[PDB]
Amino acid sequence: LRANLLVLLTVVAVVAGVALGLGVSGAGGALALGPERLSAFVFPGELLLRLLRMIILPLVVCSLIGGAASLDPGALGRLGAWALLFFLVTTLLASALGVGLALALQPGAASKEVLDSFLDLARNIFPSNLVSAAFRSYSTTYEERVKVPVGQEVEGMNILGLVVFAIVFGVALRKLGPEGELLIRFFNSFNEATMVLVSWIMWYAPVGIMFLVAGKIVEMEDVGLLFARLGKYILCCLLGHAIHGLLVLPLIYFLFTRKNPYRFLWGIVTPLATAFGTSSSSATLPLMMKCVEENNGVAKHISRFILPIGATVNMDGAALFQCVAAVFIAQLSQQSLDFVKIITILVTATASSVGAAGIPAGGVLTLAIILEAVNLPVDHISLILAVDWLVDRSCTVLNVEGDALGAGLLQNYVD
Numbered sequence: 001l002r003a004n005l006l007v008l009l010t011v012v013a014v015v016a017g018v019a020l021g022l023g024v025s026g027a028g029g030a031l032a033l034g035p036e037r038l039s040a041f042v043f044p045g046e047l048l049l050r051l052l053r054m055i056i057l058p059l060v061v062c063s064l065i066g067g068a069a070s071l072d073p074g075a076l077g078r079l080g081a082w083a084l085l086f087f088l089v090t091t092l093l094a095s096a097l098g099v100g101l102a103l104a105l106q107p108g109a110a111s112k113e114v115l116d117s118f119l120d121l122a123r124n125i126f127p128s129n130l131v132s133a134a135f136r137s138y139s140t141t142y143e144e145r146v147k148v149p150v151g152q153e154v155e156g157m158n159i160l161g162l163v164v165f166a167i168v169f170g171v172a173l174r175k176l177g178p179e180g181e182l183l184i185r186f187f188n189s190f191n192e193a194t195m196v197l198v199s200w201i202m203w204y205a206p207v208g209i210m211f212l213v214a215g216k217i218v219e220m221e222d223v224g225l226l227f228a229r230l231g232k233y234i235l236c237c238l239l240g241h242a243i244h245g246l247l248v249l250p251l252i253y254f255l256f257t258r259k260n261p262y263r264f265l266w267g268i269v270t271p272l273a274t275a276f277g278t279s280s281s282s283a284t285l286p287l288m289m290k291c292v293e294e295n296n297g298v299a300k301h302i303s304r305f306i307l308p309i310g311a312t313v314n315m316d317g318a319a320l321f322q323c324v325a326a327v328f329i330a331q332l333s334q335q336s337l338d339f340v341k342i343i344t345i346l347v348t349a350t351a352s353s354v355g356a357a358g359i360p361a362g363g364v365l366t367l368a369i370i371l372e373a374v375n376l377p378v379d380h381i382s383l384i385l386a387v388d389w390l391v392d393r394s395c396t397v398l399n400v401e402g403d404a405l406g407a408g409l410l411q412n413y414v415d
């Protein structure tokens with residue numbers, strides 16, 4: 001099956017990218033290649049990232065509008081509220097687990113005001129311009145007029161504001177009744193065309209992923225040397241993802257529904273493998289909906305609401321990774337975490353996970369939110385970037401798994 005072919009090709013692409021990076025490093029790596037050759041060698045991964053970032057905007061906006069407009073107000077008050085509560089609770093639990101694992105395992109064993117960071121988050125939630133929000137985000141800087149904060153708009157898609165606006169606009173379209181059906185159809189057709197584009201991009205995804213991994217491994221001085229530093233961090237991220245996906249989320253599924261959660265996961269394994277390979281829940285959306293509807297019997301409306309929304313708003317893996325990274329930093333640099341700082345980390349991780357793009361680059365783009373809110377050195381992300389190619393795949397797997405289990409839980413709640 002071509003879906004299984006895509007999964008196989010993407011996993012083999014990750015493995016072959018690791019092998020190619022190791023081989024290139026054995027031949028001298030960047031030092032031997034020189035910028036001229038290195039840029040061309042790494043270019044295909046950049047091209048894949050550009051292709052996915054191009055489709056983020058229309059994909060997210062149209063999917064969210066359609067999902068929000070897929071339920072009537074009679075169901076929005078019950079299904080919508082419960083879905084929002086489930087997403088919030090799951091993200092909070094993922095962030096708490098990340099904090100706990102990072103503090104316990106201590107990965108690092110051996111500037112913007114917090115108020116300004118939260119105000120910037122609130123401003124990004126409510127964008128002042130929809131067109132500007134498509135490629136810019138609010139950010140506060142300081143001028144010694146005593147520091148006085150002045151707010152600029154800096155490069156970077158405002159996924160959070162676009163998500164909020166899309167959900168609100170879908171709800172408004174549902175409110176309109178027959179008058180809004182034309183726009184619902186328009187946005188559904190646009191989303192379907194964007195999914196066709198995503199399916200086409202996923203066929204280039206193998207080569208792009210291979211070259212991206214190879215470049216990210218050639219960039220570092222030596223795998224055996226960088227992994228010496230980052231082994232505890234990688235272990236914390238992967239262990240937290242495994243605990244959340246195999247124990248916590250299944251435990252919630254079993255508590256709110258007396259069905260077997262792993263039987264549910266068996267019917268979405270293929271979505272999970274595609275998520276691991278591509279590391280883009282947005283690209284995993286179609287197969288995910290197909291599996292939840294057919295293999296697990298989730299009702300059509302339940303899926304069409306929960307999954308397109310969850311894929312952008314709900315990301316337990318992204319939240320857990322960002323939280324474990326925010327705790328890993330502050331240990332590379334000798335800062336300390338108290339209860340207030342931990343709670344700030346949790347809240348900022350929730351907001352950042354909501355504001356992440358469902359693609360390979362989602363995590364680090366918004367980890368800066370947490371780092372600024374905890375006043376941690378932002379430049380340290382350069383280290384995480386050297387390994388993000390590995391953690392991000394588990395992040396995406398958990399992000400899609402949360403969506404699937406939420407769909408099942410809501411389907412049982414509606415029964």
Ligand SMILES: NC(=O)CC[C@H](N)C(=O)O
Binds near residue numbers: 280281317361399400
């Ligand atoms: N590192 C992350 O979690 C970013 C988002 C993730 N790649 C996803 O598709 O869900």
